[PDB]
């Protein structure tokens, strides 16, 4: 009726090709801003003094990077955790030199992904669905927040956020392992179980459904054409799949309830990723992985090495080389 | 009612559980070794 | 109410959902759980007292509750030396006994007390849709919360004071005689940017501000309590909110997630409400301490630390912040917003002052910097102190690390719980939390997207 | 080695206990299956 | 009835643990591999092969025990208990790392037996054998990593040790010496694994949140029956949701589940190809253009070059302890390191 | 090998003196070291000033030499600069200043003797003792 | 749905199972215990005791170097 009411019905409309919604009213601008700035910076940003030592790092394609080595470089260590929008730079060149694009892209991206999760809830509400797809999506959101915001907060600088690049990601991981022994952190082990097991369960579920497909096609056409979109009947024989799997391992380890099976499929990777996100978020406060360096002594008192000691040697090798000009004092506390 | 006692399932159970309990006893004892 | 799946519709693993409409049983669950909280407070306090070596610093002994009591001004003197161990014991004993009482009451209500309270009393009986009654319970609890804030104020002002790490002559328990009631300061804290150098409310740095803000909080809470006792929700609130038990739970979950995140940040950064005397240095404090320690050492060796340039060309010991302030050099440049009682005496209007650095450094500052540098909040999960590549002989993890990590994790999972319950409350209010109705599946009546 | 004897004797004792408490039914089952 | 048919009947009886013909290979080999790992991690040292304690008996824990690879002196000898090295001496066989090939070979034949079991049970119950095809991925990983990589290298010593920290050591070794993260085949493996986890999560959640109202309980789990003919969740609603949220959506259930098979399996196969490359030191170690520019331009710095520096540090600091048979003596002054660290 | 008497045998004073810790003396010295010294002496280093480590060469280079147990106990009573010119009783923990070092006020002369003996024995069990901070 | 075997819950809730197993299970437990605590495991598997990692003549890691005569190599390592 009223103009505002009409606008409300448009934004919350389920007939839009892309659902907008109220969370979308924030998601779309912030995500577009982040995407445009990211593309521009990745192509053409000038080098960024990430470590705050006047040692600029070239991240963009036009300054000699390929796709693998290119990145949007985290803002300068001199900035620390200070807010550095464009309007606090003396010029655009200064803003670029100090890594302002990283802050712009990251802040907009984070707002965008939280609004994406809210938008998932919103559309589920408009369509009469159950509301918990956004809960599953909260796992990747938690991980991204850990690596882009929480870890820089705990470490005290956005220069210690994950770079927006492939090789930058690897650098982040290697330094992280050198400083926190993330491999020996049980939450990262749970994350590995989450992703290995999620892939395992994806492979099993897909293979068991594909294995039990009901015959509806000929040997020529794709078996995919045996399923018609919106058909009421089941397209595979879950009882045959259960018979096969319960004989592969044993009867009582096999799901015969599709609903319990799909809940398990949702829950395993999501929980694993929640745990690994919390692992990164707590290593942000330097509660690190297990330290068994020199845990085994012989009777005299000489250290007997274990694989943990070899791992520590690798960590030290990474530790002494990283950011080779940035440290003045013996302990890497910052 | 009145099932067999020993089966393939019995053997599968014991083949695992028996050395498992033995090994657990060994590791428990290791918990008290002094250097 | 039923106690199984057929008669409730809830499995055992969601069994507490069976309590949603059994107000007496729900009250019992809450009271017993409160008993659990108070029991942990008392038992952990007694454990910490028993495992307390009172001449060693609190933060060296894995203590998280005793620092809370010490900050309140009980059992400590200047620099945080533990004078009397008895008050800690008393706090623990009182919590333990009261937990016994609370557990007795929670068990009574959960097991034998009336199932529902509405046909027993209008005052205690409630319906989730009864907006006036829900706001009444809000009002009562707001009055209580304001009273607790005023209890903090009364302890700081009339009952021996609180520990002030910024006290002249050394950090000491002191009585706060002039809390800042000026609403400009108090509520301008809420407007400060949550970024480096501003620190939205984490930057509160003097007990006068803390006590004055608590006076304001007490007044706000009590007045809001009265306001909610005497009114009902307005039309806009009624049209905007879901009015159900699970909805109220989800609202509280969101609030708790926010508070958990805030507390983790607060303990990580703030050294006023969390004095380093009891909680150890912040990470920023330890980094700055290392820079100071080597400035002092090298200066004693004869280095002219004002003019010594490092390998990159920046000053090794001193440099400028991006706004020009004189700050410690090295990686600790990121931590130049740090303020601490041991370092501010060497700070001039422009930042670190060369004259003070060259002739005003006291031996106690050197000792404090060495201690803070060597107790940096870095440690392994199995409590091996120092950087992760260090060897096993230093058993230390900062209490700040424990508190910050734990409460960030709890904040995150309570955000997850808020999402879960908010979505469920919406779906249940709209009536599709049990799945899509085949007859009236909404998408079947929608135009195709393309 | 005496260590062998004392490490084996518990295993043997478990064997005889199980035998003396299951043997009637075990021989019943063995005979039934021929 | 011939004796072969009688045996076939007995092997394929419906019992709690199906045996089958494949069981003749699977169960003894799998039991050997598992018991060998358990025995080695509980009792067996790596003192003579690696100079490391690797068993509970020596004081190591779950994270630090391993069946360590054999000594580098043996090259790729299969290290049979009766072989020329151990010569039938069980104690010596344990001490030289004979348990590692024991576990690796018995595990390889156990994996073969398990996939043959997948084929056999699929054939018996009358379904398509796509589970075995999916299992080919883990087999490719095991073959490449535990056999082909050490076979291309100097010896079994450089195979991953069967242990948690042993695997971590192998991972960091491959980063520092091979720059394995830079390898495009590894990146396709990572894409496949993370995509498989994503598909698992998103499919499970989508199904659970588009369920039909088929019962009256808040507990939606018992509104399903395995013999029911109709779909338990709304594919149409799921498709509309994902089309409006993400832009695109599955509309074919069969393609969806084949994709859930396809993604992680292809990831495993691509990563195995990359590992085969690393077996011959055919690495994606460097970008020569950036190396040359950095060598002539001391102001050119990228994340790639920083990672190269990290690898150099790891190699120099790790090699003397990781490769004790080499007797690497790197004096303190030759170790690379940044300032103050 | 065992933690033999020779391993526990350490120089007692500068005039060639020699003492042997008992296993209990060594274990209490280790316990005290881990409790109060490892703070800035992990693995025989000195986190706050690694020019002056606990390595045998640094200990023997001090004035007077501190690689014997009496010199170590004396330093722990009255700490001095490495050339024995500056009084560090305000700057290094010592039993003589319980007012500023309370972490040490409960230690006996036997305890200081034990920790000094451990400081002399630990270097021969660990080649990394007294090395570089990252080493 | 039972493949023929007795259900586990029935077996493990029965008195006879527990009369058997309150003996069998502890005996294997203390058999493994005695395996460790008598020193049998050290000698059987060749694992060094805490005082035998190094000898009064070998202070270095006894890394095997010879391709075929490891028995003599280990003996000279002691
Ligand atoms: C609904 C509402 C949504 C609201 C959105 C608005 C934005 C929220 C997030 C803000 C992001 C801040 C980034 C930088 C944080 C920072 O600079 O630092 C943290 C700041 C504190 O700021 C610090 O405050 C400090 C105050 O200490 C100062 O004062 C002290 C006094 O004792 C000491 O003296 C100390 O030495 C001295 O430096 C200093 O000023 C520091 O420089 C300053 O950085 O926290 C703060 O202000 C605010 C508290 C932050 C909470 C932590 C984030 C929670 C994230 C959860 C993600 C979950 C996701 C789940 C998904 C699924
Ligand atoms: C699909 C998978 C299904 C699953 C299957 C699972 C079951 C697998 C069963 C197979 C077991 C394979 C054992 C491999 C033994 C081996 O290779 O052992 C190696 C030996 C050769 O011995 C090696 O030889 C090398 C070179 O020696 C030569 O050169 C030296 C230096 O000059 C000396 O002069 C020396 O005298 C001379 O012989 C070195 O000496 C090594 O130390 C030594 O180990 O080959 C040999 O026995 C035989 C060589 C021919 C057959 C090789 C088949 C395997 C090929 C693997 C790929 C190889 C390379 C690519 C890598 C990727
Ligand atoms: C004050 C906070 C609060 C309250 C009152 C509730 C209340 C409720 N929740 Mg809920 N929830 C919360 C927070 C809360 N939740 C948070 C923070 C999360 C995110 C994880 C959730 C996620 C959640 C889900 C997914 C569900 C509920 C459900 C429910 C209802 C029934 C739950 C039940 O019976 O418990 C049963 C208790 C158990 C089954 C035991 C769980 C043990 C957990 C998983 C591990 C504990 C770890 C802990 C840290 C200790 C570590 C132990 C270690 C030593 C090994 C109930 C009304 C159900 C519902 O929706 O009802 C309609 C339901 O499906 N909640
Ligand atoms: C803080 C944790 C907590 C609390 C306070 C409650 C409370 C409650 N639950 Mg519950 N629940 C929980 C966790 C909790 N639950 C978890 C983790 C699960 C998953 C396993 C469940 C699953 C569950 C189900 C399936 C059901 C409940 C139900 C109930 C209610 C009825 C209790 C009852 O009759 O059982 C009786 C139990 C007993 C009589 C055993 C003894 C219990 C007492 C209290 C033990 C106290 C011992 C203590 C040390 C003694 C000190 C006494 C004094 C001297 C201090 C009740 C209010 C029921 C309900 O909803 O009612 C409608 C219901 O059906 N819960
Ligand atoms: C928030 C917690 C809480 C709430 C809302 C209730 C509510 C109720 N209780 Mg319960 N109870 C509790 C905790 C609670 N109880 C605890 C911890 C115990 C163990 C001691 C009990 C033991 C108990 C028994 C045995 C009985 C009840 C009964 C009742 C019902 C009647 C109340 C009444 O009119 O009596 C009168 C109320 C008063 C005379 C007011 C007295 C207020 C207290 C006792 C004085 C202290 C006030 C204090 C200063 C305020 C702050 C508290 C402080 C700790 C911060 C009512 C629904 C009765 C019932 O169910 O009827 C059949 C019943 O028989 N309760
Ligand atoms: C736990 C304590 C508590 C709780 C649960 C409530 C709950 C409620 N109050 Mg409230 N209130 C309280 C304390 C509390 N109050 C106190 C202490 C006071 C005294 C100051 C008041 C004074 C008050 C008034 C005047 C009114 C309420 C009203 C309400 C009802 C609806 C308001 C609403 O939607 O909230 C949410 C708020 C909004 C939807 C407005 C948006 C606010 C901004 C835009 C959100 C941005 C927050 C930001 C992200 C956080 C940054 C922190 C800081 C920097 C600002 C609701 C049931 C309304 C009512 O119906 O009265 C009967 C109402 O008119 N209260
Ligand atoms: C139910 C409610 C139960 C108890 C309510 C609390 C009662 C606290 C009363 C004790 C106050 C001290 C009296 C003697 C004294 O003056 O101080 C003696 C000492 C030291 O306190 C000193 O008091 C002096 C008074 O002039 C000065 O102010 C000094 O500066 C001050 O240090 O206080 C103590 O040792 C007692 C510790 C106080 C802790 C009590 C708070 C927690 C109590 C209960 C929590 C229960 C929660 C259940 C839920
Ligand atoms: C409901 C329910 C539940 C819950 C319950 C609860 C939650 C509870 C509780 C409870 C409680 C919460 C309790 C308590 C208690 C306490 C006590 C009982 C005490 C005491 C005391 C004492 C005795 C002390 C003593 C001492 C002293 C005096 C000092 C010195 C030291 C000592 C310690 C000795 C459940 C889940 C189970 C389930 C069922 C239902
Ligand atoms: C004590 C203290 C202080 C003080 C403080 C204060 C005074 C405070 C406060 C505070 C406050 C006073 C607050 C608040 C808050 C708010 C919130 C948190 C909100 C919100 C919101 C919401 C939640 C909403 C929602 C919604 C929307 C969005 C729309 C639609 C509807 C709804 C409802 C859904 C100081 C710092 C000075 C000092 C220290 C201590
Ligand atoms: C070597 C060898 C062999 C083989 C052997 C065998 C085959 C055996 C075995 C064995 C075995 C087969 C053993 C076992 C074991 C075990 C164990 C050691 C266990 C364990 C466990 C645990 C520790 C668990 C725990 C838990 C968890 C964690 C979860 C839940 C709860 C429970 C408790 C379950 C022969 C002589 C032929 C030849 C030569 C070489
Ligand atoms: C599916 C197939 C599985 C294959 C593996 C199954 C287990 C196979 C184990 C075979 C073990 C071979 O073990 C080998 O036995 C021979 C014969 O006794 C021993 O030989 C020993 O006795 C013989 C005669 O009695 C002497 O000539 C010889 O000098 C002496 O060493 C070897 O020292 C031992 O190494
Ligand atoms: C769970 C199973 C645990 C594994 C087994 C645990 C027991 C370990 C067995 C060690 C037994 C004695 O171990 C010692 O080495 C082997 C055992 O093969 C024997 O070795 C001897 O016999 C073999 C076999 O013919 C020949 O190579 C040769 O004659 C000689 O080496 C030694 O004479 C024995 O002293
Ligand atoms: Ca100390
Ligand atoms: Cl780096
Ligand atoms: Cl530095």
Could you explain the architecture of this structure?
It is classed as photosynthesis. The entry lists the keywords Photosystem II, Cyanobacteria, Synechocystis 6803, Mesophile, photosynthesis. High-resolution structure of photosystem II from the mesophilic cyanobacterium, Synechocystis sp. PCC 6803. The structure is cut from a larger assembly and holds seven protein chains of seven kinds. Chain C is mainly alpha-helical and 450 residues long. Chain C has helices spanning 5-8, 23-50, 66-71, 86-111, 131-158, 183-189, 207-229, 235-240, 245-269, 276-279, 283-301, 354-359, 363-374, 399-430, and strands spanning 162-164, 172-174, 318-320, 326-328, 347-348, 351-352, 379-380. In chain C, helix 2 (23-50) packs antiparallel against helix 4 (86-111), helix 5 (131-158) packs antiparallel against helix 7 and helix 9 (245-269) runs antiparallel to helix 14. Chain C is globular. Chain D is mainly alpha-helical and 34 residues long. Helix content of chain D is 91%, strand content 0%. The radius of gyration of chain D is 14 Å and the shape is elongated. Chain G is an all-alpha fold. Chain G is built from four helices and no strands. Chain G has helices at residues 8-12, 15-37, 40-45, 70-77. At the A-E interface, helix 4, helix 5, helix 6, helix 7 and helix 8 of A face helix 4, helix 5, helix 6, helix 7 and helix 8 of E. Strand 3 (287-288) of chain A pairs parallel with strand 7 of chain C. The structure holds digalactosyl diacyl glycerol (dgdg) (2 copies), chlorophyll A (CLA) (4 copies), 1,2-distearoyl-monogalactosyl-diglyceride, beta-carotene (BCR) (3 copies), dodecyl-beta-D-maltoside (2 copies), calcium ion and 1 more. The site of one chlorophyll A has 13 residues of chain C, from helix 9 and helix 14.
Could you provide a short overview of the structure?
The structure is cut from a larger assembly and holds 7 protein chains of 7 kinds. By secondary structure, chain E is mainly alpha-helical. Chain E contains 11 helices and 2 strands; from the N terminus they run ααβαααβαααααα.
